[PDB]
């Protein structure tokens, strides 16, 4: 009787590009596009990179980024939302765990000028 209704899922992975959400109290909240690449070390984020393939289908890489100080509800939620988004995208996404200071070359490469860290973030949902 249930379909995926989360507004952000309906927006996810529709066209080539980068989309970033932050975990805020057990919800997935879009990051303003002008703040892309500035990560709060107290928070966890989900990043979807969508690339156009030659047959016009879309390639997905889902990265969940975990700040050094993010709380367990945030990192746990980031991991679960990543699984849910992959399921929503028909299992077409490769999932990548990205830890502050140890991110993959691929993830770092998304940010043309280099990603930046800043202290702080939104309060834990616990």
């Amino acid at each position: 009787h249930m379909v995926v209704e989360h507004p952000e899922f309906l927006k996810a992975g529709k066209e080539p590009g980068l989309q970033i959400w932050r975990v805020e109290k057990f919800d997935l909240v879009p990051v303003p596009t002008n703040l892309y690449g500035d990560f709060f070390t107290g928070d966890a984020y989900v990043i979807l990179k969508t690339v156009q393939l030659r047959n016009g289908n879309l390639q997905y890489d889902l990265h969940y980024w975990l700040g050094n100080e993010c709380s367990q509800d945030e990192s746990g939620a980031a991991a679960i939302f990543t699984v849910q988004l992959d399921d929503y995208l028909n299992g077409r996404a490769v999932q990548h765990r990205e830890v502050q200071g140890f991110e993959s070359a691929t993830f770092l490469g998304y940010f043309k000028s280099g990603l930046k860290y800043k202290k702080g973030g939104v309060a834990s949902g616990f």
């Binding site: 995926v4 999932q95 765990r97």
Partner: protein, 368 residues
């Protein structure tokens, strides 16, 4: 708005609480007691701490064995108690997330579902695999969880959020066997612990003083050569006893099950064997994300020892990482609390409406 409940039904201890809390509100023995003789103490049944305390007039039953429900009448009594006495809720008012052991029989998942909806009239429910909840609690979607509780230890490989059932293995040894083994080896020193209160003493000795030796042979030699590893323990009556190599011999049984006369491989080999049952292309990610969960993983030294043993089994260029969160006695419950709190989970539960249309077998389509 609507407040979900989270219940992790362990073979030894039930952990129950409210989604969005960082810890279970109620942690109590998974025991039902009934009047021992059919002749005060006078209620039809008792559950949890009160049943244990009244054991002198009650016969005690443990309806969960190896994480699998073996007596549904007793399990229903435990859940009724959990809702009405431990959580102080009306279960008809709350979605309920329940946990299940890896490879829980199909008929059992259906029975769980039938009881929630038909006996408790829950408006919604969901069943999650314990190991997967622990992995989520550690902030990962891929890894292998070594979950060791009361009667059984499971190794559960998980890739991108889903367990790989063909690669799940088990060692039929966990905390109750280690308590029983500590009881046996303490008799060598002349200390007889045989009653329930005495077994509880032994459990406390295991929980407070035992540790996993990094090098067992070397630790035995150190213990034989001097008193450096000895520790004193005060009994409730006030007597002080001395414990030596029993401290690390007890949890050594996890790595050497022959100590208990079992032919099974130790937990390190079980973990390795599960990894080797998985697609070669995911094994790197499993070795690099070995997550310990459950009460019997709480021994000091266990993560160092797992690291050593898995490093010896794997190719030398493989990065081994053992993740042993301090909260790992509760990581299943915590994973549940997070999952049940997500804005997306209202879309995931089995609703009463769905149950009414499809019956218990809906659980195989909604929860996997």
């Amino acid at each position: 708005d609507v407040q979900a409940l989270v219940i992790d039904n362990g073979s030894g201890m039930c952990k129950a609480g409210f989604a969005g809390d960082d810890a279970p509100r109620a942690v109590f023995p998974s025991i039902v007691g009934r009047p021992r003789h059919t002749g005060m103490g006078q209620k039809d049944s008792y559950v949890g701490d009160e049943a244990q305390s009244k054991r002198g007039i009650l016969t005690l039953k443990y309806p969960i064995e190896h994480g699998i429900v073996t007596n549904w009448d007793d399990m229903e009594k435990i859940w009724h108690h959990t809702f009405y006495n431990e959580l102080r809720v009306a279960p008809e008012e709350h979605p309920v997330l329940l946990t299940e052991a890896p490879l829980n029989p199909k008929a059992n998942r259906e029975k769980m579902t039938q009881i929630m909806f038909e006996t408790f009239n829950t408006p919604a429910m969901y069943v999650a695999i314990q190991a997967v909840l622990s992995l989520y609690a550690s902030g990962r979607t891929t890894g292998i969880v070594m979950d060791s509780g009361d009667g059984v230890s499971h190794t559960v490989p998980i890739y991108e959020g889903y367990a790989l059932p063909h690669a799940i293995l088990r060692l039929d040894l966990a905390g109750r066997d280690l308590t029983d083994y500590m009881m046996k080896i303490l008799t060598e020193r002349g200390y007889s612990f045989t009653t329930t209160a005495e077994r509880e003493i032994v459990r406390d000795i295991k929980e407070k003083l035992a540790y996993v030796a990094l090098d067992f042979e070397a630790e035995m030699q150190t213990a034989a050569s001097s008193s450096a590893l000895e520790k004193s323990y005060e009994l409730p009556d006030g007597q002080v006893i001395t414990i030596g190599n029993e401290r690390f011999r007890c949890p050594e049984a996890l790595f050497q099950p022959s100590f208990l006369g079992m032919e099974s491989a130790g937990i390190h080999e079980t973990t390795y064997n599960s990894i080797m049952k998985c697609d070669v292309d995911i094994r790197k990610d499993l070795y690099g994300n070995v997550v310990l969960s459950g009460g019997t993983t709480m021994f000091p030294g266990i993560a160092d020892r797992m690291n050593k043993e898995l490093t010896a089994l794997a190719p030398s260029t493989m990065k081994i990482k053992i993740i042993a969160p301090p909260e790992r006695k509760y990581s299943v419950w915590i994973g549940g609390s997070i999952l049940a709190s997500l804005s997306t989970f209202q879309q995931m539960w089995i609703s009463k409406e769905e149950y009414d249309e499809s019956g218990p077998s809906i659980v195989h389509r909604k929860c996997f």
